[PDB]
Amino acid sequence: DRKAVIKNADMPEDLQQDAIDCANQALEKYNIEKDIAAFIKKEFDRKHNPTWHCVVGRNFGSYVTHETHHFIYFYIGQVAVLLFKSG
Amino acid sequence: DRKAVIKNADMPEDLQQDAIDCANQALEKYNIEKDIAAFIKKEFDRKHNPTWHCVVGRNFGSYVTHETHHFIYFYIGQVAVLLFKSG
To answer: Which of A14, A85, B3, B37 could form a disulfide linkage to A67, CB 3.0–4.6 angstroms apart?
Structure first.
């Protein structure tokens, strides 16, 4: 549905697409940011192997160390989504 | 200086104290959330071994998988700080 604006990324494009689609689903299901983040993290552990970490919000900055090919940071509207596996 | 309100944690108390003191230093040095987060992450890699991840902001939710004894989530004012090593 909604268009994503990608800020930083390092993923195969099919995995990027899955991340954005997953976030859009989460945003439709939930308005509480903790629940949005949890839905996305859980979907990624289940479909794409553990362990992922997810942050969702309208006001945050981050500095994380990510595993190559397993990282995306994008916006849907005023909402930022950070989704990654650790390096 | 400033009092921290701890929301979730799993750290030795000396490491918790270092995390809060580090965040307070960061908040004094920087107003940009990315820079605050980066300062804290870098301090923790340097003093407490890599690799740490840090998120700082006034509006976010998260769901992450943390290594036992290496996790803290606390507030200073309206600012939340998430600092952890991955499980």
So the answer is: A85
The data reach a resolution, in angstroms, of 1.5
Closest Cα of chain B to A1: distance in Å? 22
State both tokens at B30.
């920087």
Q: After which residues is chain B broken (C to N over 2.5 A)?
A: none
Q: Closest Cα partner for B57 from B19, B39, B31?
A: B31
- Among chain A residues, the shortest Cα distance to B57 is held by A60
Put simply, the answer to whether B65 touches A82 (Cβ < 8 Å) is no
Residue B82's nearest CA partner among A30, A31, A57 is A57
Task: Give residues with Cβ within 8 angstroms of A71, minimum separation 6.
Answer: A8, A9, A10, A11, A83, A84, A85
Specify the CATH class of A1-87 in words. alpha beta
